Amino acid sequence: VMKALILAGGSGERFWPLSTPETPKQFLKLFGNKSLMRWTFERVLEEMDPKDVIVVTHKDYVERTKKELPELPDENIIAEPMKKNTAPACFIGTKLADDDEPVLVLPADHRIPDTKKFWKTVKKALDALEKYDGLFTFGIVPTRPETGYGYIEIGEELEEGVHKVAQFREKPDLETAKKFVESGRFLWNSGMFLWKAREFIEEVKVCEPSIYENLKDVDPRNFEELKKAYEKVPSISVDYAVMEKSKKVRVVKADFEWSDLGNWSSVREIEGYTEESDEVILVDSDRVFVKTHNKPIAVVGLSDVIVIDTPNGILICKEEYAQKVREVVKKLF
Amino acid sequence: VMKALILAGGSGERFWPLSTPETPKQFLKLFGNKSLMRWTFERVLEEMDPKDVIVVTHKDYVERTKKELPELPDENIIAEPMKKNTAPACFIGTKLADDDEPVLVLPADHRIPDTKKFWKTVKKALDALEKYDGLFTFGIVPTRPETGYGYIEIGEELEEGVHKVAQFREKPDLETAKKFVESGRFLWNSGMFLWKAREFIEEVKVCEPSIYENLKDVDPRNFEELKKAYEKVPSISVDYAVMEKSKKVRVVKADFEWSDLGNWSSVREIEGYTEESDEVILVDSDRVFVKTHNKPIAVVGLSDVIVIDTPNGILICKEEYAQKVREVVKKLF
Numbered sequence: 001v002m003k004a005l006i007l008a009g010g011s012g013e014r015f016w017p018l019s020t021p022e023t024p025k026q027f028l029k030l031f032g033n034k035s036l037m038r039w040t041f042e043r044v045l046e047e048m049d050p051k052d053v054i055v056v057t058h059k060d061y062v063e064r065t066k067k068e069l070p071e072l073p074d075e076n077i078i079a080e081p082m083k084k085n086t087a088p089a090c091f092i093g094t095k096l097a098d099d100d101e102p103v104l105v106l107p108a109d110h111r112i113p114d115t116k117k118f119w120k121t122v123k124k125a126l127d128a129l130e131k132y133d134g135l136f137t138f139g140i141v142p143t144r145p146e147t148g149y150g151y152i153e154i155g156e157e158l159e160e161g162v163h164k165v166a167q168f169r170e171k172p173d174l175e176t177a178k179k180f181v182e183s184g185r186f187l188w189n190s191g192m193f194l195w196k197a198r199e200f201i202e203e204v205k206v207c208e209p210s211i212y213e214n215l216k217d218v219d220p221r222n223f224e225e226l227k228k229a230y231e232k233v234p235s236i237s238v239d240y241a242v243m244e245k246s247k248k249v250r251v252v253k254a255d256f257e258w259s260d261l262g263n264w265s266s267v268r269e270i271e272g273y274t275e276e277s278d279e280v281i282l283v284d285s286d287r288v289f290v291k292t293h294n295k296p297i298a299v300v301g302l303s304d305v306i307v308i309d310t311p312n313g314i315l316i317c318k319e320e321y322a323q324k325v326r327e328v329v330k331k332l333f
Numbered sequence: 334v335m336k337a338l339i340l341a342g343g344s345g346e347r348f349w350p351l352s353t354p355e356t357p358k359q360f361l362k363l364f365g366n367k368s369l370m371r372w373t374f375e376r377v378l379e380e381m382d383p384k385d386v387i388v389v390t391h392k393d394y395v396e397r398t399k400k401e402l403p404e405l406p407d408e409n410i411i412a413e414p415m416k417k418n419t420a421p422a423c424f425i426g427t428k429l430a431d432d433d434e435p436v437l438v439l440p441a442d443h444r445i446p447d448t449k450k451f452w453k454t455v456k457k458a459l460d461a462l463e464k465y466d467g468l469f470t471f472g473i474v475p476t477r478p479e480t481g482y483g484y485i486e487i488g489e490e491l492e493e494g495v496h497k498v499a500q501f502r503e504k505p506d507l508e509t510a511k512k513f514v515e516s517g518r519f520l521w522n523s524g525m526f527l528w529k530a531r532e533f534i535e536e537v538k539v540c541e542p543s544i545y546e547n548l549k550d551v552d553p554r555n556f557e558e559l560k561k562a563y564e565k566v567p568s569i570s571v572d573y574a575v576m577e578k579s580k581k582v583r584v585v586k587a588d589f590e591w592s593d594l595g596n597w598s599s600v601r602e603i604e605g606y607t608e609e610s611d612e613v614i615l616v617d618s619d620r621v622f623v624k625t626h627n628k629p630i631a632v633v634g635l636s637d638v639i640v641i642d643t644p645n646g647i648l649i650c651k652e653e654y655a656q657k658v659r660e661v662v663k664k665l666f
């Protein structure tokens with residue numbers, strides 16, 4: 001038996017004017033009239049019973065998370081008192097399993113079209129877990145010097161497709177990322193992890209006692225004791241808090257197309273640049289990503305530009321600045 | 334006395350999405366909820382009777398012109414069967430004056446806020462016309478190497494502020510326009526002209542006979558006889574037909590600020606760049622010009638950009654390419 005832990009803490013700000021501050025990233029229907037989370041949950045339910053799926057998410061989002069995922073038990077959504085990043089959410093979650101039990105940690109914010117290959121990889125990671133223990137990550141081959149992704153160096157090969165992690169470095173500078181990619185000895189951290197519960201808990205004790213010490217005796221369904229416990233706990237990701245530090249990290253190579261729905265360029269990577277139609281007019285404008293609504297849009301003299309038009313507003317953004325659309329949300333509110 | 338000839342033949346395509354292809358530039362209300370033509374007419378009625386004012390325009394715009402200018406008698410709107418640019422229009426309008434009567438030729442697409450300084454200049458030109466004859470221009474001091482204007486080379490003084498023209502060059506290439514400015518020796522042609530009716534006609538006779546040969550004996554208010562003549566007549570601007578060639582051209586420096594309403598860049602020159610408001614959010618974007626309709630527009634990571642939103646559509650244009658909004662209209666229709 002295994003558990004799945006779904007981390008829903010999203011920041012849909014970057015996706016304005018689709019997203020309002022009301023709709024967290026997780027509930028955005030970027031594809032197929034289905035939220036990121038819903039697609040993620042349907043993917044899990046292909047091989048898993050809802051009983052064994054957990055979602056860790058801030059309390060405001062609980063009531064909606066329930067509406068979105070009616071199959072889930074109520075006891076299975078854990079209400080957090082504060083947004084403390086992934087490490088505390090992982091710990092709190094992993095505690096809900098039996099010491100022995102494998103836990104698959106999954107972000108809600110990803111896109112993975114191939115469910116079967118996804119499970120093919122998970123299965124292959126599980127046998128790995130049983131054979132070698134330690135903490136497992138899923139490596140994606142890099143196609144660019146991305147600065148918001150973690151980077152895993154490949155090490156001693158355990159078996160075909162499975163290696164020890166020589167090192168792990170989260171969110172590096174650009175030129176370093178560039179060198180990692182030029183190297184070939186690195187893969188992107190997918191953001192999904194697999195570990196046995198007891199082992200991960202012991203690694204956090206060593207790696208980040210501040211977390212371990214103040215959360216070890218806590219009941220995740222007692223909101224009050226979890227509130228007061230979180231007051232002593234920091235905001236920090238599993239990656240910084242444990243993976244960079246831990247010497248028992250493993251990586252399996254993901255055999256599936258993967259994407260982090262990070263900002264609008266991200267969506268363009270999936271769909272491709274927009275072509276001229278009756279409602280999109282391009283004069284001296286190349287590599288242009290445009291979403292119309294009621295009326296036509298004309299882009300003149302511009303390239304590598306993103307334009308989005310909803311009832312909420314109109315975004316005109318240069319591609320290298322897609323991450324700064326969050327700032328639009330600071331100013332506009 | 335004196336006549337005024339307003340030329341109304343303009344294409345508003347560069348002011349999409351404000352303008353529809355149905356509407357020409359003359360009927361656009363860029364300022365004060367009055368049409369470019371309407372401002373031009375009111376400027377002229379400051380010192381003239383409607384009866385001495387003549388508009389020359391395509392037959393398709395006549396009914397619409399009467400509604401805009403109800404003070405204008407119907408006989409003073411000369412319906413043209415085709416657009417042949419300004420040389421033929423000037424000819425048929427000027428014909429209607431008497432041999433010795435000076436004719437003031439005015440585009441409909443100018444913005445001249447100081448009516449009084451305008452007439453101060455016309456007065457000074459009328460006087461100079463009596464003393465020196467020939468064809469008059471009004472020179473603006475050039476701020477930039479504009480390729481869409483005519484350039485007047487300043488020659489000998491007749492008297493202070495009034496000069497013979499050493500050279501009139503219409504629509505030079507960029508590098509010539511840059512040299513013209515550097516030299517200090519040139520003025521922009523305002524597009525307005527003043528001449529005695531008989532003198533202009535002889536000047537077209539020598540400069541561009543096609544126009545004279547075919548229109549000399551034609552009653553401009555006899556539509557069918559004008560229709561037949563215009564099949565034989567070329568489409569050519571007064572500036573290329575006569576002004577570049579003539580040896581009888583003088584210039585009076587304009588005592589007034591002036592502006593040709595060429596494209597959205599022009600409107601920005603008048604109004605200045607947009608600043609941040611409720612409906613206009615700017616992030617890493619300077620020198621932006623933004624007009625909103627019902628929604629917030631956010632511009633991220635872009636400078637020197639025009640964004641215009643209206644029920645007809647949305648325009649996103651880099652400033653340098655403001656001419657090319659024309660090509661948007663052609664693709665869109």
Ligand SMILES: Nc1nc2c(ncn2[C@@H]2O[C@H](COP(=O)(O)OP(=O)(O)O[C@H]3O[C@H](CO)[C@@H](O)[C@H](O)[C@@H]3O)[C@@H](O)[C@H]2O)c(=O)[nH]1
Binds near residue numbers: 007148149171192
């Ligand atoms: N409950 C909870 N969830 C959170 C919190 N912070 C983040 N999450 C959730 O954890 C996941 C990661 O959030 P991101 O903000 O997307 O992290 P990241 O910068 O994308 O970086 C991580 O994932 C990358 C790929 O998606 C990795 O490359 C990187 O190494 C790291 O694991 C998302 O599902 C998000 O909803 C939190 O404080 N509380």
Ligand SMILES: Nc1nc2c(ncn2[C@@H]2O[C@H](COP(=O)(O)OP(=O)(O)O[C@H]3O[C@H](CO)[C@@H](O)[C@H](O)[C@@H]3O)[C@@H](O)[C@H]2O)c(=O)[nH]1
Binds near residue numbers: 422442
């Ligand atoms: N009746 C009629 N009028 C016309 C036609 N074509 C143009 N016009 C009118 O003639 C005037 C000048 O036309 P534009 O098309 O704006 O001319 P331009 O290229 O701006 O160039 C002229 O003006 C510039 C500055 O205003 C000058 O710099 C340049 O030398 C030239 O005189 C405008 O009022 C326009 O309505 C036509 O086929 N028929």
Ligand SMILES: [Mg+2]
Binds near residue numbers: 593595
């Ligand atoms: Mg003009």
